Write a protein that binds this ligand. Structure first.
Ligand SMILES: CCCCCCCCCCCCCCCCCC(=O)OC[C@H](COP(=O)(O)O[C@@H]1[C@H](O)[C@H](O)[C@@H](O)[C@H](O)[C@H]1O)OC(=O)CCCCCCCCCCCCCCCCC
Ligand SMILES: CCCCCCCC/C=C/CCCCCCCC(=O)O[C@@H](COC(=O)CCCCCCCCCCCCCCC)COP(=O)([O-])OCC[N+](C)(C)C
Ligand SMILES: CCCCCCCC/C=C/CCCCCCCC(=O)O[C@@H](COC(=O)CCCCCCCCCCCCCCC)COP(=O)([O-])OCC[N+](C)(C)C
Ligand SMILES: CCCCCCCC/C=C/CCCCCCCC(=O)O[C@@H](COC(=O)CCCCCCCCCCCCCCC)COP(=O)([O-])OCC[N+](C)(C)C
Ligand SMILES: CCCCCCCC/C=C/CCCCCCCC(=O)O[C@@H](COC(=O)CCCCCCCCCCCCCCC)COP(=O)([O-])OCC[N+](C)(C)C
Ligand SMILES: CCCCCCCC/C=C/CCCCCCCC(=O)O[C@@H](COC(=O)CCCCCCCCCCCCCCC)COP(=O)([O-])OCC[N+](C)(C)C
Ligand SMILES: CCCCCCCC/C=C\CCCCCCCC(=O)O[C@@H](COC(=O)CCCCCCCCCCCCCCC)COP(=O)([O-])OCC[N+](C)(C)C
Ligand SMILES: CCCCCCCC/C=C\CCCCCCCC(=O)O[C@@H](COC(=O)CCCCCCCCCCCCCCC)COP(=O)([O-])OCC[N+](C)(C)C
Ligand SMILES: CCCCCCCC/C=C\CCCCCCCC(=O)O[C@@H](COC(=O)CCCCCCCCCCCCCCC)COP(=O)([O-])OCC[N+](C)(C)C
Ligand SMILES: CCCCCCCCCCCCC
Ligand code: NA
Lengths: 642, 94
């Protein structure tokens, strides 16, 4: 009714007992269901914790008393909002947000399912609208709220234990939801990684045979891959450098130590779900990420990902990439002679007469083959990825320019057999693109690759800003000049062309006398060669210097991502050629699984030195008694026992 | 090197003068300015009447001040725009 929400709102537990007496005399069951606030579904219970005072209403104990004596207690606590916008938000969710440890205890005693799915649009994915996504389940609310006490409670209370393994509408478990909630700030990162640990550690105490991190949501994404696909570097850094020193939660570690002789200590990083794995590799999810996907370029600076790629580089990709640079250089030397030595008489196609004219056809045939090759490699890149229209034009600057080179090649073939001299028009573009596209292969080299990243950035921010204003000025004063000219440079091309000679230092200030006003002609060109040459070109240099100062580290980390995409494509191009990827690692016994069996893992070694943490009685060292690779080790009867 | 931030803040002032002149050029054209806001009940005036104000919403996130028993929240029980809210019988009383 109206007065009940008024009395449940106002902390006044006197009028309620009068209505305990009232609802006694009909049923309390449907009448409370009819006293659910329409358009929201709020029974009196949810209303109470909303209007709290110092962490207690004092009607909440009473409203439970009305429901325990008189039948049907469940339908008050299992009740929730009815609206589609708070759909499924039980009163248990309220106590978890308001940080009331007690009311979480009180409600779960009286039922209050700990698996109630807060479906509502407020509780769904980001939506571009106001809302807080935590994972729709009360255990995920507590984890994303800094309530660790409420986490441990809901799993071992006495009555109903939360499910670590349960999923939301979008399939995200609690740990997935710890990834969705991360926002790359330090205090969030400090927390989420702390709370990621505890549930992940708790899931070895309870349910010791699950491996939560292997759980995949509706989109087939694990918490690690979801941290890498969504730009979550702090969580990624945590999951990857994860070392847990506790014995029964050591198998959940991921950064191990294999020996420590003095300051030296050799760490092992697992490579599960990073190398060319089954579903979603962390390298693929980072390397083949959409362009927004924050910190694409920093997610690989997370150790061991640098060393792992630099391992693949120095072991098989470097020797393949330099063969790709060679076969492309030869291809450019052959499409260049076949073009330099083209026929200059008659119409195409051109019959063969001499031996020198035979060699070029081998160079012309073989040259079209690469165009067919670089044409399909752009179709593969299209269908293997399905890049959006955005991603297609904003981060794929290489594949555009090899595919584009390929189109001028095929057009050069279509026109060489259509009897038209425009084959040359396309054939020379395909050369100029082709040689410029050797700047692709500067990415096997750190200094030349970073140099070519700066070229990319300069073209996009500094030169595109420049060439707008320059073409506006050029076309602007150009029209003003040719308007003034009377009968030759009485054209808009030759005036725009002469006014572009100034910037390249070839401008005659007297390229016409065919005008009637000379002050007008020279005030107008001086205006031009001050605002374009003196100002706007020298300003460009100034802008570049500002740019170079800023993109120094950004260009090094776009380079490592460029090189990474080459490492992955090289792996993925040779599933058949050599065998796969040479596996970039070794299968080592890190310890024993919690069921006693061996824990063999594909692990990456990183020798490290430390001049401060001298003593460090580790114990977590997995093969100390042999202190290196050497031959097989003892396994060190310490912490492991099986 | 020096005018990087100064040029961003002359730009926003350039754009602002365009926003205002656009508003002031169309007192007759469309109607005025589309009002850039919403008339919300923030609370009650000290004489008990409603305090309706044209207010601009800014969603914000905080990972340090977790608990913050605000109370000053003006429409907590509905926790968003959604549909009309309860007004939260806390601090307001009228
Ligand atoms: C109306 C017109 C319609 C047009 C529709 C079709 C347009 C097609 C072309 C579009 C582009 C036209 C050129 C202007 C754009 C810039 C070019 C450039 O610098 O991109 C650098 C590129 C980088 O690679 P990637 O992509 O791997 O790097 C990505 C990238 O850094 C990303 O940000 C990272 O996140 C990601 O990790 C990383 O991986 O590097 C190369 O592409 C090798 C070097 C290539 C040479 C670079 C110099 C300039 C080349 C262009 C000029 C060619 C000259 C001859 C022209 C003849 C005809 C006139
Ligand atoms: C048939 C004949 C064809 C033509 C000849 C060529 C045939 C094909 C040639 C294939 C082999 C490619 C060169 C390998 C050189 C040794 C590698 C090395 O150690 O480099 C060092 C540096 O060295 C440089 O930076 C050198 C210059 C780099 C630009 C490209 C030079 C290519 C040479 C030919 C140009 C031809 C142009 C086109 C001509 C038509 C190491 O690199 P870094 O700087 O330390 O960075 C590495 C990354 N890291 C440090 C992070 C790990
Ligand atoms: C006629 C005038 C021609 C030029 C007009 C240009 C438009 C006018 C004004 C442009 C600057 C203002 C717009 C900024 C857009 C930001 C969004 C974005 O992604 O931008 C991208 C491209 O943004 C471009 O503007 C590039 C468009 C042209 C591509 C190069 C063609 C060659 C031009 C050569 C000159 C000769 C032109 C042709 C011959 C005359 C760049 O941003 P980004 O790469 O994302 O940077 C961060 C990357 N990160 C997130 C991975 C870290
Ligand atoms: C991106 C390009 C870079 C390279 C070019 C750099 C320059 C800029 C490129 C500009 C592209 C357009 C060139 C001119 C139009 C086409 C030709 C034509 O019919 O012209 C007519 C229009 O006569 C005029 O005087 C031009 C009027 C404005 C047309 C251009 C609009 C703005 C384009 C953007 C302007 C830049 C500023 C805004 C954008 C930043 C007549 O002139 P005409 O050509 O002699 O025609 C034959 C006449 N005849 C029969 C007497 C012989
Ligand atoms: C990633 C960055 C690197 C890649 C860059 C990729 C490319 C970048 C560049 C791109 C520019 C390409 C322009 C088109 C090709 C050349 C013009 C042409 O065909 O002229 C023909 C016709 O032209 C006309 O009739 C044009 C008339 C308008 C003049 C404005 C353009 C002036 C061209 C220059 C502007 C320079 C601007 C420089 C700064 C932008 C020749 O003219 P005509 O028949 O002898 O005389 C007719 C005259 N009338 C018709 C006007 C009376
Ligand atoms: C940024 C905001 C906008 C700015 C607007 C700026 C524009 C404002 C200005 C507007 C006025 C422009 C001139 C009007 C026409 C005058 C006559 C003429 O041109 O030629 C006449 C004389 O030719 C000569 O060369 C003789 C001197 C002429 C007058 C020179 C005035 C200089 C003023 C400087 C002012 C500096 C202003 C600086 C502004 C920063 C006709 O003779 P001719 O056949 O053409 O001559 C060829 C024979 N000869 C070789 C013997 C010479
Ligand atoms: C380190 C890398 C950089 C430096 C070296 C760069 C390469 C060497 C440097 C410079 C080249 C010097 C000139 C070559 C000969 C002239 C052209 C010719 O005879 O045949 C034709 C074109 O030629 C071709 O398409 C290539 C094959 C040429 C024939 C001889 C075999 C060369 C094999 C090379 C194998 C690939 C390259 C090597 C890798 C496998 C001529 O066609 P036409 O229509 O009859 O025109 C008449 C011409 N003529 C009257 C003069 C005959
Ligand atoms: C008279 C002369 C005598 C001497 C002759 C001397 C002969 C000299 C040799 C070659 C001449 C040209 C032959 C074709 C190759 C073109 C260049 C090329 O492929 O470069 C690639 C290297 O390529 C390789 O590493 C593999 C070699 C090519 C295999 C397929 C050839 C095309 C056949 C038809 C296939 C149709 C079906 C397509 C699917 C199979 C470039 O490497 P990438 O790693 O690909 O990187 C570029 C791509 N990306 C930058 C966009 C990422
Ligand atoms: C993304 C697209 C889909 C990709 C997948 C499928 C791709 C298609 C599959 C295979 C490839 C086939 C593509 C179509 C070719 C048709 C012929 C042709 O273009 O002729 C051109 C000739 O050329 C010139 O005039 C100058 C050079 C430009 C040619 C550009 C062709 C490629 C597109 C590069 C874009 C560059 C611009 C963008 C970068 C700045 C046009 O002139 P013409 O017709 O010869 O005129 C006289 C002849 N006529 C009387 C018959 C008219
Ligand atoms: C210089 C490379 C070839 C330029 C001519 C292109 C048309 C086709 C020539 C050979 C035929 C290929 C099928
Ligand atoms: Na000069």
């Amino acid at each position: 009714r109206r007065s009940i929400f008024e009395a449940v709102a106002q902390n006044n537990c006197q009028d309620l007992e009068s209505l305990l007496l009232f609802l006694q005399k009909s049923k309390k069951h449907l009448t409370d269901n009819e006293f659910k606030d329409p358009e929201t579904g709020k029974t009196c219970l949810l209303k109470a914790m909303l209007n709290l005072h110092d962490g207690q209403n004092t009607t909440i104990p009473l409203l439970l008393e009305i429901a325990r004596q008189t039948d049907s207690l469940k339908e008050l606590v299992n009740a929730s909002y009815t609206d589609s916008y708070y759909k499924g938000q039980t009163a248990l969710h309220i106590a978890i947000e308001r940080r009331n440890m007690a009311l979480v205890t009180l409600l779960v005693e009286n039922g209050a399912d700990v698996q109630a799915a807060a479906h509502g649009d407020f509780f769904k994915k980001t939506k571009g609208r106001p809302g807080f996504y935590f994972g729709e389940l009360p255990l995920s609310l507590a984890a994303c709220t800094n309530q660790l006490g409420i986490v441990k409670f809901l799993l071992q209370n006495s009555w109903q234990t939360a499910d670590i393994s349960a999923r939301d509408s979008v399939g995200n478990t609690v740990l997935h939801a710890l990834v969705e909630v991360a926002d790359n700030t330090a205090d969030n990162t400090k927390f989420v990684t702390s709370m990621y640990n505890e549930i992940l550690m708790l899931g070895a105490k309870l349910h010791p045979t699950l491996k939560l991190e292997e759980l995949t949501n509706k989109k087939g994404m694990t918490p690690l891959a979801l941290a890498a696909g969504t730009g979550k570097i702090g969580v990624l850094a945590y999951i990857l450098q994860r070392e847990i020193q506790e014995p029964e939660c050591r198998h959940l570690s991921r950064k191990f130590t294999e020996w420590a002789y003095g300051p030296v200590h050799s760490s092992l990083y697992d490579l599960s779900c990073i190398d060319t794995c089954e579903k979603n590799s962390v390298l693929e999810v980072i390397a083949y990420s959409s362009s927004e996907t924050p910190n694409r370029h920093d997610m690989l600076l997370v150790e061991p990902l640098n060393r792992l790629l630099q391992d693949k580089w120095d072991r098989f990709v470097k020797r393949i990439f330099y063969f790709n640079f060679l076969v492309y250089c030869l291809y450019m030397i052959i499409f260049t002679m076949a073009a330099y030595y083209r026929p200059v008489d008659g119409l195409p196609p051109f019959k063969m007469e001499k031996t020198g004219d035979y060699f070029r056809v081998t160079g012309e045939i073989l040259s079209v083959l690469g165009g067919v090759y670089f044409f399909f490699r752009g179709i593969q890149y299209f269908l293997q990825r399905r890049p959006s229209m955005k991603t297609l034009f904003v981060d794929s600057y290489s594949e555009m320019l090899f595919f584009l080179q390929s189109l001028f090649m095929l057009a050069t073939v279509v026109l060489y057999f259509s009897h038209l001299k425009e084959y040359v028009a396309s054939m020379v573009f395909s050369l100029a693109l082709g040689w410029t596209n050797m700047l692709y292969y500067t990415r096997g080299f750190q200094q030349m690759g970073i140099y070519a990243v700066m070229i990319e950035k300069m073209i996009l921010r500094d030169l595109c800003r420049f060439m707008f204003v320059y073409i506006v000025f050029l076309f602007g004063f150009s029209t003003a000049v040719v308007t003034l000219i009377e009968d030759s440079y009485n054209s808009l091309y030759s005036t725009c062309l002469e006014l572009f000679k100034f910037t390249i230092g070839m401008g005659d200030l007297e390229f016409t006398e065919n005008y009637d006003f000379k002050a007008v002609f020279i005030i107008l060109l001086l205006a031009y060669v001050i605002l374009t040459y003196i100002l706007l070109l020298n300003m460009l240099i100034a802008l570049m210097g500002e740019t170079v100062n800023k993109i120094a580290q950004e260009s090094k980390n776009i380079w490592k991502l460029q090189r990474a995409i080459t490492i992955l494509d090289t792996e993925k191009s040779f599933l058949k050629c050599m065998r796969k990827a040479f596996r970039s690692g070794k299968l080592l016994q890190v310890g024993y699984t919690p069921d006693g069996k061996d824990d063999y893992r594909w692990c990456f070694r990183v020798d490290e030195v430390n001049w401060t943490t001298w003593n460090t009685n580790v114990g977590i060292i997995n093969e100390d008694p042999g202190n290196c690779e050497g031959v097989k080790r003892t396994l060190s009867f310490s912490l492991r026992s099986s």
